[PDB]
Amino acid sequence: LLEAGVHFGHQTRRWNPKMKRYIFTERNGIYIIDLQKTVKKVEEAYNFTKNLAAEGGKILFVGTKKQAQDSVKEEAQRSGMYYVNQRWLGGTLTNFETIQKRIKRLKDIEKMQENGTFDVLPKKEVVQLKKELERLEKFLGGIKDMKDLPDALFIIDPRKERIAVAEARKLNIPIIGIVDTNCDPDEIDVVIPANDDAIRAVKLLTSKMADAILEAKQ
Amino acid sequence: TQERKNQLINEFKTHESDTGSPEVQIAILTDSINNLNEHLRTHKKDHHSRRGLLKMVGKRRNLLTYLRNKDVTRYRELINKLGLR
Amino acid sequence: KVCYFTSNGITHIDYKDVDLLKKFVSERGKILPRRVTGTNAKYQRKLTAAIKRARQMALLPYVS
Amino acid sequence: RIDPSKLELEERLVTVNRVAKVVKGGRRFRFAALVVVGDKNGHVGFGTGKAQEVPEAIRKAVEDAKKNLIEVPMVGTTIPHEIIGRFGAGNILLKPASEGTGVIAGGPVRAVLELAGVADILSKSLGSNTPINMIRATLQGLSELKRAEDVAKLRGKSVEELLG
Amino acid sequence: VMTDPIADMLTRIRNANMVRHEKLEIPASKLKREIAEILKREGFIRDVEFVEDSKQGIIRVFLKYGQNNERVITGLKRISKPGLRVYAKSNEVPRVLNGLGIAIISTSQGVLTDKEARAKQAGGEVLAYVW
Amino acid sequence: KYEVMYIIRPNIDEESKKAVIERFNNVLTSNGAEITGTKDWGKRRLAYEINDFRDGFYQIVNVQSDAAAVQEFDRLAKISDDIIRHIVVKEE
RNA sequence: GGGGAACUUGAGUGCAGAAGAGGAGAGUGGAAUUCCACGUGUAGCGGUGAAAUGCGUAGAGAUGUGGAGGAACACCAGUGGCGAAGGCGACUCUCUGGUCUGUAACUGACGCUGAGGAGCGAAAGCGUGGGGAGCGAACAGGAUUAGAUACCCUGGUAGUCCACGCCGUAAACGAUGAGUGCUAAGUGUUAGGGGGUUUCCGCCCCUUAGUGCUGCAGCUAACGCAUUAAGCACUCCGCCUG
Numbered sequence A: 001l002l003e004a005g006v007h008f009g010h011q012t013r014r015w016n017p018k019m020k021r022y023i024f025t026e027r028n029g030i031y032i033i034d035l036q037k038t039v040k041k042v043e044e045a046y047n048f049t050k051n052l053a054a055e056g057g058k059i060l061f062v063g064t065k066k067q068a069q070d071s072v073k074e075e076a077q078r079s080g081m082y083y084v085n086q087r088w089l090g091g092t093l094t095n096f097e098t099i100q101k102r103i104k105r106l107k108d109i110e111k112m113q114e115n116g117t118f119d120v121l122p123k124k125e126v127v128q129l130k131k132e133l134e135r136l137e138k139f140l141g142g143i144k145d146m147k148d149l150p151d152a153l154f155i156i157d158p159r160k161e162r163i164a165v166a167e168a169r170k171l172n173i174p175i176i177g178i179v180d181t182n183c184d185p186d187e188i189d190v191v192i193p194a195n196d197d198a199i200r201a202v203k204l205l206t207s208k209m210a211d212a213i214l215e216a217k218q
Numbered sequence B: 001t002q003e004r005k006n007q008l009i010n011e012f013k014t015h016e017s018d019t020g021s022p023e024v025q026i027a028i029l030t031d032s033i034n035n036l037n038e039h040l041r042t043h044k045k046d047h048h049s050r051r052g053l054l055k056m057v058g059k060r061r062n063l064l065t066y067l068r069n070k071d072v073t074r075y076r077e078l079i080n081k082l083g084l085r
Numbered sequence C: 001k002v003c004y005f006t007s008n009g010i011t012h013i014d015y016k017d018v019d020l021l022k023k024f025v026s027e028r029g030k031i032l033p034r035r036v037t038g039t040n041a042k043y044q045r046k047l048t049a050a051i052k053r054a055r056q057m058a059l060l061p062y063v064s
Numbered sequence D: 001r002i003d004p005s006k007l008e009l010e011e012r013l014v015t016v017n018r019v020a021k022v023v024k025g026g027r028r029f030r031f032a033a034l035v036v037v038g039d040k041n042g043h044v045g046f047g048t049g050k051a052q053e054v055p056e057a058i059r060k061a062v063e064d065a066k067k068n069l070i071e072v073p074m075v076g077t078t079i080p081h082e083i084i085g086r087f088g089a090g091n092i093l094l095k096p097a098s099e100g101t102g103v104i105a106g107g108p109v110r111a112v113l114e115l116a117g118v119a120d121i122l123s124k125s126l127g128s129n130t131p132i133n134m135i136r137a138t139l140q141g142l143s144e145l146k147r148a149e150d151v152a153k154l155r156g157k158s159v160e161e162l163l164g
Numbered sequence E: 001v002m003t004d005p006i007a008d009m010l011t012r013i014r015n016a017n018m019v020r021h022e023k024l025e026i027p028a029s030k031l032k033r034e035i036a037e038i039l040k041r042e043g044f045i046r047d048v049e050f051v052e053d054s055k056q057g058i059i060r061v062f063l064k065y066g067q068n069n070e071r072v073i074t075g076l077k078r079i080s081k082p083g084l085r086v087y088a089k090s091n092e093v094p095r096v097l098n099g100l101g102i103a104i105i106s107t108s109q110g111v112l113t114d115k116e117a118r119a120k121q122a123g124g125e126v127l128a129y130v131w
Numbered sequence F: 001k002y003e004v005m006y007i008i009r010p011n012i013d014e015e016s017k018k019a020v021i022e023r024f025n026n027v028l029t030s031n032g033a034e035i036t037g038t039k040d041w042g043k044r045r046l047a048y049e050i051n052d053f054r055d056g057f058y059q060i061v062n063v064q065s066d067a068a069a070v071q072e073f074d075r076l077a078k079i080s081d082d083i084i085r086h087i088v089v090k091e092e
Numbered sequence G: 001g002g003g004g005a006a007c008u009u010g011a012g013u014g015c016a017g018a019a020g021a022g023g024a025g026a027g028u029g030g031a032a033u034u035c036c037a038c039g040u041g042u043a044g045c046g047g048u049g050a051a052a053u054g055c056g057u058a059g060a061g062a063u064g065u066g067g068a069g070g071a072a073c074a075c076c077a078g079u080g081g082c083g084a085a086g087g088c089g090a091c092u093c094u095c096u097g098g099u100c101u102g103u104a105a106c107u108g109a110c111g112c113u114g115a116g117g118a119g120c121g122a123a124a125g126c127g128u129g130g131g132g133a134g135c136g137a138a139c140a141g142g143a144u145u146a147g148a149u150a151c152c153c154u155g156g157u158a159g160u161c162c163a164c165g166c167c168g169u170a171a172a173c174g175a176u177g178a179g180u181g182c183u184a185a186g187u188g189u190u191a192g193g194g195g196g197u198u199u200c201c202g203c204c205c206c207u208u209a210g211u212g213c214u215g216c217a218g219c220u221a222a223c224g225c226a227u228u229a230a231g232c233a234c235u236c237c238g239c240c241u242g
Helices: A034-055 A069-079 A096-115 A126-140 A162-170 A201-217 B003-011 B022-042 B047-070 B072-082 C019-024 C041-056 D054-067 D107-116 D131-143 D148-155 E005-017 E030-041 E114-119 F014-030 F069-079
Strands: A059-062 A082-084 A152-155 A175-179 A190-193 D010-023 D026-038 D043-051 D092-095 D121-125 E025-027 E047-051 E058-062 E076-078 E102-107 E110-113 E124-130 F002-008 F034-045 F055-064 F083-090
Touching (some): A034 A190, A059 A069, A069 A082, A069 A201, A096 A126, A152 A162, A162 A175, B003 B022, B022 B047, C019 C041, C041 F083, D010 D054, D010 D131, D026 D054, D043 D054, D107 D121, D107 D131, E005 E030, E005 E076, E005 E124, E030 E058, E030 E110, F002 F014, F014 F034, F014 F055
Parallel strands (some): A059 A082, A059 A152, A152 A175, A175 A190
Antiparallel strands (some): D026 D043, D092 D121, E076 E124, E102 E110, E102 E124, F002 F055
């Protein structure tokens, strides 16, 4: 869309003074110019993600909002890269070596429960081993195939997710992502003004991310 | 109340609509000091009015210094008829 | 949460009229505060002054 | 802007510092140490580490040093201009000394400056005399120095009118 | 009560630089007017222009921020304070920040800045250093 | 501009009722003041006992005065053995 | 800097309003406490961790009438309001100070600070004459204790109170001197003003001056401060140098 999907904005004007200083006064949507600047912004992010993904880099997808987490999860699936859906455990990329030597345990134990000798004690180890798979895989999610550090990020709510954005800022990852009206712009390289309440449009906006990253390769 | 000040301003009338004239101001000042003085003599320890007394007398005297600096002639013809030193 | 005096825009108290002060005084004789009355701030002081002059004038009782 | 560890970098230990913890069983003894690293031409960092023993303590410090570096501008083997160091009662004066004068500095400031490889510089300690606040103040200092060409760029001018 | 208009305007534009205003207003006088055009000549500022009213005028400045969101302005300093004036000889004009800094000086041949003042051998009170 | 409210004890014949209210009005109008309004309340049960009377007589006299009659009325009322209580209020 | 002619924003005067435990003086009211007289009334009251000293058959405590007296103003009451500070809460009156909003009807820089100087200045204390209900240093007794000049109990003097002088000090604190200008926002709250709604009931948006709490930038050793700066600057005073 060049039109508003569910872009009605934010309810309460408890918000952050950064870029919203003199935008025209029509309603509680005091920042109504976001409607007309979003289109040029997402297309600029579109071409930028196009050439970086055409170079051969890897994006991954982080979001723990209760309405968009599975939406971006499935989007990561059929776009063909990595994701974080549930709990962002502390320091994934600045702990990359420790995280991959923990994910090695998951790969080994899933291949053991796939084709290995399942039984040496067919209750006393198999039952909590079978638990331990989904136990780590819950908070882990789409961390099963990095083997290499990803060179870009997209976030739905950097307000909720301080840990990932600060970790990326320390690890000079270019952070991209949408900005709810309470969030803070300049710590993110390319910001896209988007209301977090748009539970329907929150997937379409990053669907417009996904077809770009799909078109970049082929 | 306000009758004495009205007659004082229209007697110290210089310009057609002057209230900002220094000669106008010190007249209302003088009546304020005298009203407060015969107030204080019957109420000696009204210190919170002694303070206003000191404020207005200081305002009076330094604006008098201003008037001396401006033109001492009109100062003289004010002082002789208002009668103080 | 409703201020009686702004609700009908009534001006100054006129202390001789009493029946509103009757239902602004507690039955044991004390003033109901703003937590139960919910009047505007600038009228509560003229209210308590009014019931004070009523109490000195002996139309409203000190204790009951 | 982060400079990787592709270069060769010299290290120099300046201080091993005894640290302690009091616990129910008694006093518990630990070792902090800070080191400064860099190259002789333009890049310098420092690193801190805590461990129970000296070699892996300075090893932790030296990996943190490999993590953090900062570039120093260098106009004719000396600093360009005036700069005072400033961090937390750490005040270090740096003055663009003339050539052939060598390094004139106190202990830790010389330890970072010679590891920066600057030929002619002179300085003074005006803040406190704890070494970590020294080095932090000095690198805050050399962080502030700018070349002439980019200042001319900000001016919309050239370098000739700014050197003269 | 406001003692030095130069100091008032000086720290006002310093304060706006440190907070990234593009807009800034300065109540007008002749002295800060030609200091405005001197700064416009030296390019520390995008544009300055004047509008007038019944109260001594009012001037506005559009302040630069370079190409990548960086401070073109790295500090300002008043020297010729009131209560303590300072004067320097024509040969003792200080090369502030050894060239990259710029000093503004009121001289007997009008007010000029540091380099042309030294070139034409003028001298006087050093008024403000900008770094 | 001063509104007056005073009480006389009920055990009084109407011959003396008119007498006291009239002489107090003459006091007010003879001390240079003018009566801008009079009102009456008659009988009203008091909020409390004062001396031995459960009851009292209420009366309203509205006077525009130059602040000379009210103090002397105050001393007359408080020296008078028939008035129990009274006040004077600036109506603004 | 000196002199001369300007101007109105700084500072002010008028005009229209608003709020206030601001102050001095006078008068008035109520609840209790104490004491006294009497009626009823028996044998305890009171007090503490236990207790004891005290008061009570000479009728106490309890209880109701009726007085005497001095004290402070319940509820209102609010990190509310006023004052420069100390501070100021019952009501009524006289006199009197100050603050804030609008207004540009008038002056045209009359401004800021302030050594010395002058004046105010909690409580305790001092002088003279009053007053003395309760409270209550000193002191008395009874407890506690190894001891207890104390903590505890029952009393209790000076004072506390008034008038007029004097002392001139406090953790007299925001442990932050006064004035001026600039710098993200959010949220109460006091007293005002303006606009659209209606000029009602009350809704919204501005708006000055305060008054609280959050919170950027910046600053600090840290705590933290943050348009009521401990930020940015300028003026003037006071002060420090283990």
